[PDB]
Design an enzyme around this catalytic site. Structure first.
Site, PDB file in Angstrom:
ATOM      1  N   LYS A 151     -52.399 -18.693  26.664  1.00 30.24           N
ATOM      2  CA  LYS A 151     -52.885 -17.279  27.050  1.00 30.24           C
ATOM      3  C   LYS A 151     -54.452 -17.157  27.383  1.00 30.24           C
ATOM      4  O   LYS A 151     -55.071 -17.801  26.711  1.00 30.24           O
ATOM      5  CB  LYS A 151     -52.400 -16.249  26.117  1.00 30.24           C
ATOM      6  N   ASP A 197     -48.988 -21.655  22.699  1.00 33.46           N
ATOM      7  CA  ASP A 197     -49.706 -20.593  22.671  1.00 33.46           C
ATOM      8  C   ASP A 197     -50.700 -20.326  23.726  1.00 33.46           C
ATOM      9  O   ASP A 197     -51.906 -19.571  23.458  1.00 33.46           O
ATOM     10  CB  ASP A 197     -50.165 -20.434  21.165  1.00 33.46           C
ATOM     11  N   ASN A 207     -56.718 -17.613  24.383  1.00 37.27           N
ATOM     12  CA  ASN A 207     -57.091 -18.848  23.873  1.00 37.27           C
ATOM     13  C   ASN A 207     -57.560 -19.895  24.861  1.00 37.27           C
ATOM     14  O   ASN A 207     -57.424 -21.073  24.697  1.00 37.27           O
ATOM     15  CB  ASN A 207     -55.616 -19.450  23.316  1.00 37.27           C
ATOM     16  N   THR A 228     -47.021 -15.131  21.673  1.00 34.84           N
ATOM     17  CA  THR A 228     -46.986 -13.641  22.151  1.00 34.84           C
ATOM     18  C   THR A 228     -46.276 -13.321  23.219  1.00 34.84           C
ATOM     19  O   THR A 228     -46.411 -14.397  24.234  1.00 34.84           O
ATOM     20  CB  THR A 228     -48.600 -13.644  22.649  1.00 34.84           C
ATOM     21  N   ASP A 274     -57.073 -22.767  19.737  1.00 32.56           N
ATOM     22  CA  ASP A 274     -56.103 -22.218  18.895  1.00 32.56           C
ATOM     23  C   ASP A 274     -54.822 -23.062  18.971  1.00 32.56           C
ATOM     24  O   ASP A 274     -53.979 -22.760  19.476  1.00 32.56           O
ATOM     25  CB  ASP A 274     -55.824 -20.806  19.149  1.00 32.56           C
TER      26      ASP A 274
HETATM   27  O1  LIG Z   1     -61.274 -15.278  17.683  1.00 30.41           O
HETATM   28  C1  LIG Z   1     -60.934 -16.477  17.722  1.00 30.41           C
HETATM   29  C2  LIG Z   1     -61.959 -17.448  18.143  1.00 30.41           C
HETATM   30  O2  LIG Z   1     -63.281 -16.781  18.869  1.00 30.41           O
HETATM   31  C3  LIG Z   1     -61.965 -18.652  18.256  1.00 30.41           C
HETATM   32  C4  LIG Z   1     -63.078 -19.931  18.410  1.00 30.41           C
HETATM   33  C5  LIG Z   1     -64.120 -19.436  19.177  1.00 30.41           C
HETATM   34  C6  LIG Z   1     -65.259 -20.298  19.454  1.00 30.41           C
HETATM   35  C7  LIG Z   1     -64.675 -21.567  19.302  1.00 30.41           C
HETATM   36  O3  LIG Z   1     -65.709 -22.662  19.655  1.00 30.41           O
HETATM   37  C8  LIG Z   1     -63.653 -21.895  18.699  1.00 30.41           C
HETATM   38  C9  LIG Z   1     -62.718 -21.201  18.237  1.00 30.41           C
HETATM   39  O4  LIG Z   1     -60.994 -19.368  17.725  1.00 30.41           O
HETATM   40  C10 LIG Z   1     -59.858 -18.446  17.214  1.00 30.41           C
HETATM   41  C11 LIG Z   1     -58.699 -19.136  16.780  1.00 30.41           C
HETATM   42  C12 LIG Z   1     -57.976 -18.531  16.038  1.00 30.41           C
HETATM   43  O5  LIG Z   1     -56.834 -19.016  15.422  1.00 30.41           O
HETATM   44  C13 LIG Z   1     -58.066 -17.133  15.913  1.00 30.41           C
HETATM   45  C14 LIG Z   1     -58.905 -16.343  16.456  1.00 30.41           C
HETATM   46  O6  LIG Z   1     -59.011 -15.269  16.699  1.00 30.41           O
HETATM   47  C15 LIG Z   1     -59.915 -17.194  17.223  1.00 30.41           C
HETATM   48 BR   LIG Z   2     -54.385 -13.074  26.048  1.00 30.35          BR
HETATM   49 BR   LIG Z   3     -59.325 -22.907  17.349  1.00 32.18          BR
END
Ligand SMILES: O=c1c(O)c(-c2ccc(O)cc2)oc2cc(O)cc(O)c12
Ligand SMILES: [Br-]
Ligand SMILES: [Br-]
Ligand SMILES: [Br-]
Ligand SMILES: [Br-]
Ligand SMILES: [Br-]
Ligand SMILES: [Br-]
Length: 275
Positions: free
Chosen positions: A139, A137, A142, A178, A159
């Site tokens: 992208k 995943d 992420n 995606t 993620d």
């Molecule tokens: O929006 C997301 C997000 O901000 C973050 C994230 C931000 C800061 C961190 O330190 C760790 C994770 O992880 C995610 C994981 C998901 O599966 C889905 C999400 O929508 C997010």
């Molecule tokens: Br993206």
């Molecule tokens: Br995460």
């Protein structure tokens, strides 16, 4: 495997919401005993065997098992895991500079800026693939920046919800990310390996350099059809002053046959990347 079943609120105070997806919501938090700050990811559990709402326990345990293995500067780390009837709560490393996606939207980069991001992505993926972990995943949304107010932001891959251990060279599961970023073998429901990530890296590189998505159609089905047909080209309006070596790098990743695609090791030795 079971997780800590004490109330997470007895040990952490939550603050600002970082974001949310289909089944997860992520909130900034602070551990009471140390003052240290984390990102708490609440993943909604499935309420029945056959349901489609929530995440299956098998899928949650897989994500947690993979996260427990990883310790590298370019990948998110896992601190603790809690659970209750409704949620599994992952206490993750806090990366507060926002998505690479939002960073791109606020600012195309120069080739230097692009390679500065890409090299960190490649290093993180080299680590993952060395442990036989496919992310599945990759992208810009992420990829999280540590601090977006510096000339060369540092990044971490996040993620791991689709991530799998590939111990037989390929996996044959329900795996679909995606559409803009998935490799043709994903679109065609074929066995998947580490190669799928390398395709995604090619898409990311194209976007970093041009600000445009190489396979994007007007609907998700068009995008997927484009991916399967390898229907992309380098528009001169976007790429006229981009080096041919950068195009070569992308071209060797956006290859339908996973066997002929550059590996993560190939990508680090490629003349555009190699020092
Ligand atoms: O929006 C997301 C997000 O901000 C973050 C994230 C931000 C800061 C961190 O330190 C760790 C994770 O992880 C995610 C994981 C998901 O599966 C889905 C999400 O929508 C997010
Ligand atoms: Br993206
Ligand atoms: Br995460
Ligand atoms: Br906060
Ligand atoms: Br490797
Ligand atoms: Br799409
Ligand atoms: Br690889």
């Amino acid at each position: 495997t079971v997780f800590r079943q004490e109330n997470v609120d007895d040990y952490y105070d939550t603050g600002e919401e970082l974001g949310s997806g289909q089944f997860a919501v992520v909130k900034k938090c602070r551990e009471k005993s140390t003052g240290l700050q984390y990102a708490a990811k609440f993943i909604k559990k499935r309420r029945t065997k056959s349901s489609r709402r929530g995440v299956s326990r098998e899928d949650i345990e897989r994500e947690v098992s993979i996260l427990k293995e990883i310790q590298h500067p370019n990948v998110i780390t896992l601190h603790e895991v809690y659970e209750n009837k409704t949620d599994v709560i992952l206490i993750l490393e806090l990366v507060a500079g926002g998505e690479l996606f939002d960073f791109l939207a606020e600012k195309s980069l120069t080739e230097e800026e692009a390679t500065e991001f890409l090299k960190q992505i490649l290093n993180g993926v080299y680590y993952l693939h060395s442990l036989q972990i496919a992310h599945f995943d990759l992208k810009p949304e992420n990829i999280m920046l540590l601090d977006r107010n510096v000339p060369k932001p540092r990044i971490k891959i996040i993620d791991f919800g689709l991530a799998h251990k590939i111990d037989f060279g390929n996996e044959f599961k329900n795996i679909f990310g995606t559409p803009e970023f998935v490799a043709p073998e994903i679109v065609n429901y074929e066995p998947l390996g580490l190669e799928a990530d390398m395709w995604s890296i090619g898409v990311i590189t194209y976007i970093l350099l041009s600000g445009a998505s190489p396979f994007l159609g007007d609907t998700k089905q068009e995008t997927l059809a484009n991916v399967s047909a390898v229907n992309y080209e380098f528009e001169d309006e976007y790429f006229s002053n981009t080096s041919a070596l950068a195009k070569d790098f992308i071209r060797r990743l956006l290859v339908k046959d996973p066997k002929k695609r550059m590996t993560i090791q190939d990508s680090l030795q490629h003349p555009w990347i190699k020092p």
